[PDB]
Amino acid sequence: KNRPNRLIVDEAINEDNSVVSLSQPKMDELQLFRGDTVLLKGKKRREAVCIVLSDDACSDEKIRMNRVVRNNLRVRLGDVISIQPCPDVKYGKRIHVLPIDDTVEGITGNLFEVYLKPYFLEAYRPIRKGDIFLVRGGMRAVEFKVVETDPSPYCIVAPDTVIHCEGEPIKREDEEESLNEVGYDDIGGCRKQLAQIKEMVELPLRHPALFKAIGVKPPRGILLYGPPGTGKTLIARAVANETGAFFFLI
């Protein structure tokens, strides 16, 4: 029960926060079609529900998912996850979502009709209790957590199910990070340069114990140079957030 359900996370090409992209040999091997609600188990007893679509540029162990679902499953890029297909509910009953105080500051009016209204229109997306998703608009990005899921634990969009969610901003739990921070998706250009830095600091930062079982010196001095205003500090913040290492700034 180990072989078909182990793949490694990598970067994404698609922008939807619910789609996960797998290569054609694995999806015919896994016996999976388009649209199917699937479930991902990761580190620390966490779950993620996702619609699946097909892509081309992957291997047979690579899964492409956006940053929102990647942070929802409590895993990071380059680690391994377990992927099982589930059966579909194809309705909802009464969902409930709350906003986050850390993202909502100085927003006036109601967030409901302007944001959550146009979002769940004609795009069947599954959701689970206790997740975090993000909506973009009005020159902002707003976070929403799902608290209560009436019919199943996971429920797809279903326009008969209106949203009753008129609640106060709920306190963001202090162990998990916001999704308005910086990551590999928030750096435009520099594919080659991110390739070099990602291959240079994969092993020492992700797998620390490995460098106690061998006498091999990994590179420790990296010097970034380029014209001013090209976002060099941004790359370091990104790499820090994506490997989960402590970041000090002098």
Add this chain to the structure above:
Amino acid sequence: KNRPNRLIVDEAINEDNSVVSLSQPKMDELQLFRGDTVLLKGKKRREAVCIVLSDDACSDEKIRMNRVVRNNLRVRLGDVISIQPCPDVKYGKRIHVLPIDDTVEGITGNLFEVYLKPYFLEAYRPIRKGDIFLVRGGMRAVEFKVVETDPSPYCIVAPDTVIHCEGEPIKREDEEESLNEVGYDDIGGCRKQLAQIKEMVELPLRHPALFKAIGVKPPRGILLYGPPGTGKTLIARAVANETGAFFFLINGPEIMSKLAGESESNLRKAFEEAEKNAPAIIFIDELDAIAPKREKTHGEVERRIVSQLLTLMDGLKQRAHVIVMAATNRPNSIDPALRRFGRFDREVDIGIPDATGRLEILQIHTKNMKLADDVDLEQVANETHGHVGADLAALCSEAALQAIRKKMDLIDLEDETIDAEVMNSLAVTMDDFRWALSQSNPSALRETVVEVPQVTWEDIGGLEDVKRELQELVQYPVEHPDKFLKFGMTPSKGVLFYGPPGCGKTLLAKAIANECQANFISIKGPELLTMWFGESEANVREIFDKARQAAPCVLFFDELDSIAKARGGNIGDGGGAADRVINQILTEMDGMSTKKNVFIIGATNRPDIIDPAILRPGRLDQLIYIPLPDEKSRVAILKANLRKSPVAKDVDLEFLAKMTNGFSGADLTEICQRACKLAIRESIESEIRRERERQTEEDDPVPEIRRDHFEEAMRFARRSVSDNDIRKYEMFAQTLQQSR
């Protein structure tokens, strides 16, 4: 019982930690055969058991043993040991070995089956109780001590005897050192430089009492210089560990990062502490950071630090048990008050290794890497021109990290962390080295290279009178100068090759530098033009100084007329003779040491425009005309250039020679290379045809350059030399002793 059993330890050529190598006269004198278990008694009532094999390059008092057995016997290199043959057990019963806590850190799994299993297979090695040996693998070196030896005190390998050794890491006894430290074996390249340092610090450090029975001053200031990253501190650590002297380490930035009084106190404390624990070595690295040039001290505290170092170095002429070695980058980058007699009087240049040295360093760093068989370190060593030791260390580490990042980490999915046996099953490919060597390694060298070249007399085709003339001019004097003294003739210290462009001047000079087995410093034409254009002709002296730091040499001042040919040639800038750089060459050549075996060789393509003050006697004056090659030499040129390429039987080199006349060797090599280019193009067309198969073992691309290529590329043969060229060369010839 003293005579047959006393020899002195020296360095090793073999890598096995159990073999000891002795010369043929001693082993027939000692009545010893191959394979015999022998016993060595050394200092402090210690023992060593060893298998013996035969070697060639030793005397009758030298024993070659590896570092492991040398440390097992509690002796060091250059000391004396006692050697007795014993009888053999030829079995074992139940041996027991333990690992060391100092070497084993973060090793997971069991060390037994992965290491001790493949080690004692088909190699009969004797062992004794209480020794220390070392095993290499899994990108580590692990130490093992033998605790219990059941049948004899010494027992040879015997595969019936399995090893029961499942024990905890045993605490390394605190008087003895680890064998993962640095020694003379852990330095690749630098044979000459280690020879100088080993002969310089043998007596003061090994035999201290000797310098209390004579008034003789041993050298106490040694200055190591060379490019950064060449491992200068490593040499000092090595020499320290091999002589057993106390090693103190001062460094530049650490002294300059403290407050004023506290930097003064640390500089004082270091010298007094190291003088307390005599015999010692004090090593100050990054000397040019702590004591730069005079005008480069903009502050005041800097001059006080330099003066403090000066007065401490002059307070050391009383003591004979302290030696001070420092490291810099170039000799003209520190305060000239330090490079004087009594303070820093010996200067050693480490410099860049060569192909043999690069092969040495690559063997040092891949010593426990478990390479595959297809990887050819000769390819790498030939393809790393411009790399120093730190770059090759980075190359090996990067190659290993590439060989652990693309597979066997993302195969660790069912598993969580690295397995020991999995880690051991890590081979590297030649393509992996091609990747690591191709990209991401900027070589850190723009420096002139000084080495023994690799072209020999078999490569130049023809010109045998010039061979027996150059052999005379270079080798005759330095071989045996007694005849020159009986007849009172000073040697000629120069030649001037003049002739047409591209007939093998550089080749000839590199060949005569090869046979003489001397270094070869080449100074191109662009370098002279650079020194004339930037108008800094001073650093020419540096070149000559470099020549005297690498003696013997063959300075080759190629394109010596390029300055003249760039200054309007015949007419321009008034129309004088001399220029800046050529004047500086005269001034440096005249005022140099008349016998050092430094041989200056010029070269030129226009022998008339060079200023006449260079061929006056006492300078380079023995003019040699390099002639245009002829038939019997053209055939030799052609076969020597084709000697690296496949060639068939139908190629008529006789007709090729007869057909091409007045062509310089450069053009014939162009013909050969362009014929090979057409051959390469034909082969790639054959590869695309046979790649585009009908469905898409008749693989042979015909790797044989047929006559068609030569007879077709012969249409692109161009005479680079006219007739009036040869005529004005003969006109310069008649201005010599031929017809005048």
